[PDB]
Amino acid sequence: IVNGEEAVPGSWPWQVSLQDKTGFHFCGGSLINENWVVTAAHCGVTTSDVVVAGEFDQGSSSEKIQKLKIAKVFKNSKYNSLTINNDITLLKLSTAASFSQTVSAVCLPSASDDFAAGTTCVTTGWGLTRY
Amino acid sequence: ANTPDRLQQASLPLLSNTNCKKYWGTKIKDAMICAGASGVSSCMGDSGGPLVCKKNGAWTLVGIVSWGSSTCSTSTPGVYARVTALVNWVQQTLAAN
């Protein structure tokens, strides 16, 4: 995030990090419950990719994180490569997540919920702080 | 260069789709939602990430980082997958598995 702010460790329990076999963090994700994660369809996640939960400092060697394996990927078939519309993917874990203080789920809205423009929201992640 | 190690957070306002078209024209579909253009922006590595807002006490996933300015411009808004337009698909998926 550009101009973002270092968060309080553990204050965003559903935020997960997705990493490939080579170990690179390429996308973020959100736990909607113990067995599922929601991310972007364009992240092109595979079952050899790993979901890391409960982490704060990726450069730490002492924090207790949960490296969860992925059982199956479900990319919204409506996703369009040309328009990037319907950019969503659901991940079913093999290694269920164990919820607690630092690892929790985020809520899902209903199809009819309306979030008015001007509403102050929040976004988190391990994206570049400058491009 | 290299993705940051510590988790980052940022506050930002949502925009109506009509407003968003100001920056992205016809590339903004009904299944998307924009936020930002307020001195903050999502950058490489944040995609798939969450965009949460409060609804009676709880942070709800309103958006999922999707795409935006190629330079991570703080003067242009980022685009997100509008979860309300996708929750139906999500629900079906969780049931079929």
């Binding site: 702010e5 204050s11 965003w12 329990p13 559903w14 929790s104 789920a105 985020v106 | 942070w59």
Partner: peptide, 11 residues
Amino acid sequence: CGVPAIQPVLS
């Protein structure tokens, strides 16, 4: 869901 056990602090 949505209620962090460790409350988030922003600026």
